[PDB]
Design a protein around this ligand. Structure first.
Ligand SMILES: Nc1ncnc2c1ncn2[C@@H]1O[C@H](COP(=O)(O)OP(=O)(O)OP(=O)(O)O)[C@@H](O)[C@H]1O
Ligand SMILES: Nc1ncnc2c1ncn2[C@@H]1O[C@H](COP(=O)(O)OP(=O)(O)O)[C@@H](O)[C@H]1O
Ligand code: SF4
Ligand code: SF4
Ligand SMILES: [Mg+2]
Ligand SMILES: [Mg+2]
Lengths: 576, 180, 122, 255, 69
RNA sequence: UACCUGGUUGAUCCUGCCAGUAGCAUAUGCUUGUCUCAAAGAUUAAGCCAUGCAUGUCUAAGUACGCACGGCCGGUACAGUGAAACUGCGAAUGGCUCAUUAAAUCAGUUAUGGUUCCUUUGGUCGCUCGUACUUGGAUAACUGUGGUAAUUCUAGAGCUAAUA
RNA sequence: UGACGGGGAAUCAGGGUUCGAUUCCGGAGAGGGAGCCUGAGAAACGGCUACCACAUCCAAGGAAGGCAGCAGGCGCGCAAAUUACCCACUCCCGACCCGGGGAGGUAGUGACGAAAAAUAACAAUACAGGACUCUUUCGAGGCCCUGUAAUUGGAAUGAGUCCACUUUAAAUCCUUUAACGAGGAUCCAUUGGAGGGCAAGUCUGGUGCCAGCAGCCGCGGUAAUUCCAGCUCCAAUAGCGUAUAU
RNA sequence: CCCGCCUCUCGGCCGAAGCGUUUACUUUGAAAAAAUUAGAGUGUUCAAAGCAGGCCGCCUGGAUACCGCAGCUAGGAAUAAU
């Protein structure tokens, strides 16, 4: 049974004129435990959130009716679809797929959004919340009885609707993929189109490098190609804006809608949600306590389902799930294919540097030569002291738990206090410190690897890509983590980002990577935040815009009334 | 708007005084004699005799040449001589009211299998009917409350697919006749 | 095993003969309709796939089975007059499966456009 | 209802169509036609339930679009076309002819007529007026409008028309002493010779009939259809010939 | 008991032996009449209501040991 | 099957009500092997609604120059199958609920001699004493240029029909 | 007025009394009110125009709304079902044999209710009765019947698994039939009761006006015919108990 | 139980017809939506139901009655008002 909570709005609740009938009618007040505390000298009633029993007595006893009853989510075990193990995560509901349109799934991380894909694609038979004695496919098809899906799963069981997924963990694919991009992509096409899939995804300039050659941006866009040529009907796109810049995110969004025949089944799952208005037609939402249970809501429309989620209150249920709305010279590397000619630029202490790049522009080569590796030109600065370095792709190899790995292999004599209250307590790795690092998903893997790179003392922090594999909620948490750490440690740091809202917030100083994308590159002298974004967004020819109330960066339509009047003045984003 | 019929009726009337010892005594005697299963099987026969007697008790207050009397009395007495509870000579409407409740219990198929010698006791007759052994002129009857009218009372035989009829004996003996 | 044919009406308007089949099969299961078509086609001097039977209900007790059957003049009158589910029981016909809900979604989506675009909006 | 109705449920249909209760929710509504809605047979009832030439409702349509069925010598493609009370329903593929005649229970019978007999019908003349430089018209009970009638014809008479042409061959005058059939109320279907008419100003007139058995009834004047002259009927009759036997003699005849 | 539906306050009798102990305060109970249709008698003064359920489990199932809290 | 029984007193006969007894519908508790039927968001809120769906239609017989397919064994107005749009018709029936309504609704009855009626079915349609071997102008489908963040929004340019 | 009207429903000796939102007819309305376009037919809402009220998207310039249709979720509640399949049926619409129909049909959840009806049968042996032709009594007979005993026995069969048929748009269920399937036939029938009303303990252990049962009368203060338990029994029986309208 | 000895205008040994104080009452007759309710027929395997079905192309059902009050009608003229 859902927990119900009494909810007061601020308007039409003027407490001086209506004689405080809500407090005097409540049963919990009439023992003396104060769920309601009002006075006639006040501006609002305050109903307590853990002392309300949710019994609905206070609602009818109000003169200017302002009091609503609102569900708060709980463990329900009502129409459970799949539970993974003993004392483990429980996926309650199944999403409904639809022909010929795109389905988006937004929410938090660790809530079950990839597990929903594996059940709808034939990759799992769910055990219906019963892990000892799993029911088999006959009795699964009598539990979705009276729904559409016991026809749809019958198409899965005889393979009348073929299901191919794009994997969430995109960095690990060349371990089962050997050779060249020309051979491994083109032997498995099974439709010889070969013409739109590269030009919509900016490819055939990467086709004689190896599959092991690519950095994480180009590693991502290869996998979007390998699902799209294939002949099937059911496609699931796991986090397709991971490791990508904004210009390639729109091209990935357009090609997903080029996979629509009206008989094809496309659902996607996003955490970026500024191309989601250009990417999907209907959006389901996943609430719950993270990794204890997750439930799928009903599908809402594109513009509708976002603004429902950003307030965090679902209107088709009455459920509320959230109340919150010093000098280095320039050099040439050429690894094997193309050079990056850095222009010699200045450098500071106790300031922040943000790399603004493209898919193959040289960000993960410039963060290596600051650690003193791969230096074929004479000169280039060596730092005096040891350096912290985060890798792009963390393929971990460890022993046992993270309490051996974090707490007794780096700073065994700890730096708490003060280490944990400033850094570790918002980063929330004390809950997952019991679990081993080898079973981890990509959200916790990225979150645990930052803890060492902040936890190491060094002079220059090489930090790259914190906005991979995380949700939208803990991406502004990382910003106050890094801003309050290095400007109170008085050291400086290299931060490397793809996301627009993260890179705008921190940046003291800006390093721009100009030139032709992935064929000849130049890293410019360090510019300011105002001209640095407004030059770089003139290289995208893409203009951003704040939604005025939840501060969300939204992208203008390409030739529009807002876009050409912003590209005229060159303010590609106001107040950077 | 559906293409249905919801027409149904109840076919027993529960007694008013529930614990009168004389009523319990007489109906338990009828249960134990005639091999009924519960008291609702007695009350249903009381309801059908009560409906018959209500029809005759309605017709008997008329002038005797009103044609509703002369048509429906002849039909009702013809059905009672057809099922056999009123004998062929005494077809007058005053002899409907002299029907006892043991007339319709004698014409059941269970009592007419026990009285026609096809069972060793009356409880053997009901368990013989319910196991698809008894047929009435090539229709295999699984109803112990089948009221046998007397152009079907003559043909009561064992089934053509039964072990006490034609052949193919049951699973007990054919598992028993495999010894090695 | 034994076919008896109850009331017979020869029907000159739809070019057939109309009858009610009695099938006595006292030691067997319900006989297939193919065997009934072979026995009645051996009875009425005609070929066995111009005759169509349906609706056979086995009576209670193991006894007779009673249904309908109709014997056409030729196969072309059968392809004009017989219902398409009853021809599709014979392999003479097959329906294209979408069947009802994808057609309805394609009907409500082809109302949103105009012109030649209704063909290239699916 | 903001307009006309187009459907008719099964339990609200006429009793004399003798429909089931469980075959479906709806009954066929008769089309608008010559005959009234409670007093007609559609063709889908007449071919599906009375004659059993077509088992399901699509096969009555497959019969009628092959131009098989003639109603009054005219080829009728509507399957719900109303017909009744000596519409001559003629099927020429099998050479049969049917005239719709009430049997004495009040139901439309399958009653067969001779192939020489199906060139005429009878019609009760309901309205006599003049028009349009003195042209006299005549309106039958199946709404045939005939110009230039015989000038002795008055209301409530019976004429006999040729079914090929539409022209009056001869007429019967309404009297005592003519044989009569009722198209009517509780005494629908009984055939007898007329004995009386009581004439009332301002209301329905009651006409007393005496049967071939001698039992008598009376109905309203709008229910009296004259069959013949004298005691000679001009049509083929049903096999009981309109004598209502009581439930006692009908049981004794079924015995 | 204070009723959810109209907010009036009643006094209800929790019938069987030891069935007081299965009740926490601030619970939903489903309260039926006492059997005499508006008149309050027994030997208990001014009480005409009795409790059937507590928190969607009935007091017979709690009392016999067939269900638990 | 036109029926009664316990309770005022030390005891009795009564007025009398309470409680019993049997149907019946709404819920709820405990229970459950077969099989034919079968009500099911009315009661309180005629309160609020995400999403799919619930009304469209082409014959021999209104208008095709879309190669969209296709005959002509090829030389002429058009073979034929036909997506689209114009046109005609249906969308006023069916469905759902019971909020208003107490001579209002509704029911039997009687009348339109005080009115309308698409459709069907019969009548009428050289009754009139005054370019015709067939007349005009356009606009859609189509082609082409675009706007708008946003709709089953539609604007400009060029064609061509009619049972418009 | 917790009032849509009627055909009707539950009770019923005759009379009455009460109920009818509800599948047929007739009316009214599509959030509250208005006002209109087309049309033969509307004051249409799966049409339009505003006002009120509430709500969605927005580039804050604007755009679109109406489940008292089928399913579904919110909420209120003591109180009510699956976002399934199809035009085979029954009919309606259309220019029409040909297309369409959450109208309808079909399945699912379903102890609201209604009809049928399993949960053993028979033969032994032993014991007890019964009447006995014999027997004043001890004592007889399968020279005759009735009951019991977790004391034996081989005959019958469906619950159920499940090839097929058959049903049907295509499946399902029912019916037919092939193979498996019964000893304690653990393949284990429940719900209320035993003072009177009211069919059934004048039993064994606990508590000792406390806990409680009790519709009423009443029982409970150390032989409780009433509480809490066991045994036995006794109504009803695939059902019965309680609460409210009647 | 039924009629008879003890109204007038006139139409083919008068059917037809000028009409007589009203009504209440009664008895027949017309018209009274089907479904439900009594009810006839018929072995859904019995039954609740259903309108089917039966005989070796043929035969035959899908009845009937009640529907109060008000209206309409012809027979009666005790009892009751004027
Ligand atoms: N082992 C190798 N052999 C040959 N060429 C390589 C190898 N590794 C990298 N490259 C090339 O050098 C370039 C280096 O890529 P870079 O590190 O700039 O990408 P990145 O900055 O990580 O991209 P993003 O940051 O968008 O994920 C790539 O374009 C790649 O083609
Ligand atoms: N085999 C498993 N064992 C334990 N937990 C699992 C298993 N599979 C999935 N989970 C849990 O299910 C959740 C799935 O998260 P995920 O689908 O990655 O969400 P998202 O991709 O939206 O971040 C994780 O929190 C994980 O703990
Ligand atoms: S909710 Fe209660 S206390 Fe608050 S303003 Fe309203 S009446 Fe006053
Ligand atoms: S929900 Fe209950 S506890 Fe909370 S304010 Fe209302 S009456 Fe009080
Ligand atoms: Mg995922
Ligand atoms: Mg990178």
């Amino acid at each position: 049974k859902l927990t119900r909570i009494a909810i007061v709005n601020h308007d039409k609740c003027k407490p001086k004129k209506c004689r405080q009938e809500c407090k005097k009618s409540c049963p919990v007040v009439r023992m003396g435990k104060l769920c309601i505390e009002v006075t006639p000298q006040s501006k609002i009633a305050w109903i307590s959130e853990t002392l309300c029993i949710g019994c609905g007595i206070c609602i009818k006893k109000c003169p200017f009716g302002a009091l609503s009853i609102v569900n708060l989510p709980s463990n329900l075990e009502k129409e459970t679809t799949h539970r993974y193990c003993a004392n483990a995560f429980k996926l309650h509901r199944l999403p409904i797929p639809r022909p010929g349109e795109v389905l988006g799934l937004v929410g938090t991380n660790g809530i079950g959004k990839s597990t929903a894909l594996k059940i709808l694609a034939g990759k799992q038979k769910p055990n219906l919340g019963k892990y000892d004695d799993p029911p088999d496919w006959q009795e699964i098809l009598t539990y979705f009885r009276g729904s559409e899906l016991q026809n749809y799963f019958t198409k899965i069981l005889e393979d009348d609707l073929k299901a191919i997924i794009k994997p969430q963990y995109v960095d690990q694919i060349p371990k089962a993929a050997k050779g060249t991009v020309g051979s491994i992509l083109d032997r498995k096409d099974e439709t010889k189109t070969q013409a739109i899939v590269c030009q919509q995804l900016d490819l055939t300039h990467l086709k004689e490098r190896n599959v092991e050659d690519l950095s994480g941006g180009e590693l991502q866009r290869f996998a979007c190609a390998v699902v799209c040529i294939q002949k099937a009907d059911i496609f699931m796109f796991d986090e397709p804006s991971s490791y990508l810049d904004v210009k390639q995110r729109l091209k990935a969004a357009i090609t997903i809608r080029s996979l629509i025949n009206p008989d094809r089944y496309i659902i996607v799952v996003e955490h970026d949600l500024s191309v989601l208005d250009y990417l999907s037609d209907f959006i389901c939402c996943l609430y719950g306590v993270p990794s204890a249970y997750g439930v799928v809501t009903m599908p809402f429309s594109v513009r509708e389902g976002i603004n429902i989620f950003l307030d965090g209150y679902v209107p088709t249920e009455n459920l509320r799930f959230r109340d919150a709305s010093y000098k280095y010279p320039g050099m040439k590397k050429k690894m094997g294919e193309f050079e990056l000619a850095i222009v010699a630029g200045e450098f500071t202490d106790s300031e922040i540097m943000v790399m603004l790049g493209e898919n193959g522009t040289g960000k993960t080569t410039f963060i290596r030569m600051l650690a003193g590796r791969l230096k074929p030109d004479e000169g280039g600065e060596v730092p005096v002291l040891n350096v912290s370095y985060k890798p792009q792709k963390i393929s971990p190899k460890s022993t046992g738990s993270v309490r051996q790995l974090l707490h007794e292999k780096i700073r065994d004599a700890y730096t708490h206090p003060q280490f944990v209250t400033d850094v570790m307590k918002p980063l929330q790795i004390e809950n997952i410190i019991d679990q081993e690092v080898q079973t981890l998903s990509g959200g916790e893997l990225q979150r645990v690897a930052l803890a060492l790179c902040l936890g190491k003392p060094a002079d220059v922090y090489l930090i790259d890509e914190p906005s991979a594999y995380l949700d939208s909620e803990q991406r502004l948490m990382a910003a106050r983590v890094v801003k309050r750490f290095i400007l109170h440690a008085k050291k400086t740091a290299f931060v490397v980002e793809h996301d627009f809202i993260m890179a705008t917030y921190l940046a003291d100083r800006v390093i721009v990577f100009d030139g032709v994308p992935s064929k000849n590159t130049v890293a410019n002298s360090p510019q300011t935040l105002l001209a640095g974004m407004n030059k770089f967004l003139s290289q995208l020819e893409i203009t951003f815009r704040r939604d005025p109330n939840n501060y969300r960066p939204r992208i203008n339509k390409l030739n529009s009334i807002k876009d050409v009047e912003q590209k005229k003045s060159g303010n590609y984003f106001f107040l950077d | 708007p559906v293409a249905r019929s919801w027409v149904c009726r109840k076919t027993y009337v529960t007694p008013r005084r529930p614990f009168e010892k004389s009523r319990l005594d007489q109906e338990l005697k009828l249960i134990g004699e005639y091999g009924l299963r519960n008291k609702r099987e007695v009350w249903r026969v009381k309801f059908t005799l009560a409906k018959i007697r209500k029809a005759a008790r309605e017709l008997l207050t008329l002038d005797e040449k009103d044609p509703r009397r002369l048509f429906e009395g002849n039909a009702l007495l013809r059905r009672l001589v057809r099922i056999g509870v009123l004998d062929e000579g005494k077809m007058k409407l005053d002899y409907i009211l002299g029907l006892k409740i043991e007339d319709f219990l004698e014409r059941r198929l269970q009592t007419q299998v026990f009285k026609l010698g096809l069972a060793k006791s009356i409880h053997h007759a009901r368990v013989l009917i319910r196991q698809r052994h008894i047929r009435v002129r090539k229709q295999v009857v699984n109803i112990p409350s089948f009221i046998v009218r007397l152009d079907s009372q003559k043909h009561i035989d064992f089934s053509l697919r039964s072990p006490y009829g034609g052949g193919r004996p049951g699973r007990v003996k054919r598992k028993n006749a495999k010894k090695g | 095993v034994t076919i008896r044919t109850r009331k017979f009406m020869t029907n000159r308007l739809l070019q057939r003969k109309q009858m009610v089949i009695d099938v006595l099969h006292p030691g067997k299961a319900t006989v297939p309709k193919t065997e009934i078509r072979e026995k009645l086609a051996k009875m009425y001097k005609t070929t066995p796939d111009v005759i169509f039977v349906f609706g056979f209900r086995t009576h209670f007790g193991g006894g007779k089975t009673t249904g309908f059957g109709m014997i056409y003049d030729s196969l072309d009158y059968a392809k004009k007059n017989e219902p398409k589910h009853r021809l599709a029981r014979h392999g003479l016909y097959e329906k294209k499966k979408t069947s009802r809900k994808q057609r309805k979604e394609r009907k409500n989506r082809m109302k949103k456009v105009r012109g030649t675009a209704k063909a290239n909006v699916g | 209802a903001r307009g006309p109705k187009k459907h008719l449920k099964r339990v609200a249909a006429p009793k004399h169509w003798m429909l089931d209760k469980l075959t479906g929710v709806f009954a066929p509504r008769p089309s608008t036609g010559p005959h009234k809605l409670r007093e007609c047979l559609p063709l889908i009832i007449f071919l599906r339930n009375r004659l059993k030439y077509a088992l399901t409702g699509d096969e009555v349509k497959k019969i009628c679009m092959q131009r098989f069925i003639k109603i009054d010598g005219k080829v009728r493609t509507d399957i719900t076309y109303p017909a009744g009370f000596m519409d001559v329903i003629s099927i020429d593929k099998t050479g049969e002819n049917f005239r719709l005649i009430y049997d004495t229970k009040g139901r439309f019978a399958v009653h067969r007529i001779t192939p020489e007999e199906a060139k005429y019908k009878l019609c009760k003349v309901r309205k006599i007026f003049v028009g349009t430089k003195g042209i006299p018209h005549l309106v039958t009970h199946d709404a045939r409008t005939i110009r230039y009638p015989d000038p002795l014809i008055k209301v409530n008479d019976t004429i006999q028309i040729d079914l090929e042409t539409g022209k009056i061959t001869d007429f019967i005058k309404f009297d005592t002493g003519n044989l009569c059939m009722v198209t009517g109320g509780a005494n629908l279907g009984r055939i007898g010779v007329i004995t009386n008419r009581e004439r009332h100003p301002g209301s329905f007139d009651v006409v007393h009939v005496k049967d071939a058995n001698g039992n008598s009834f009376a109905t309203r004047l709008s229910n009296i259809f004259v069959i013949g002259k004298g005691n000679k009927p001009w049509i083929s009759l049903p096999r009981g010939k309109g004598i209502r036997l009581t439930i006692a003699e009908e049981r004794d005849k079924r015995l | 008991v204070q009723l959810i539906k109209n907010g009036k306050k009643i006094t209800a009798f929790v019938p069987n032996d030891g069935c007081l102990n299965f009740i926490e305060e601030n619970d939903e109970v489903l309260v039926a009449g006492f059997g005499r249709k508006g008149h309050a008698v027994g030997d208990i003064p001014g009480v005409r209501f009795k409790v059937v359920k507590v928190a969607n489990v009935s007091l017979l199932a709690l009392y016999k040991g067939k269900k638990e809290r």
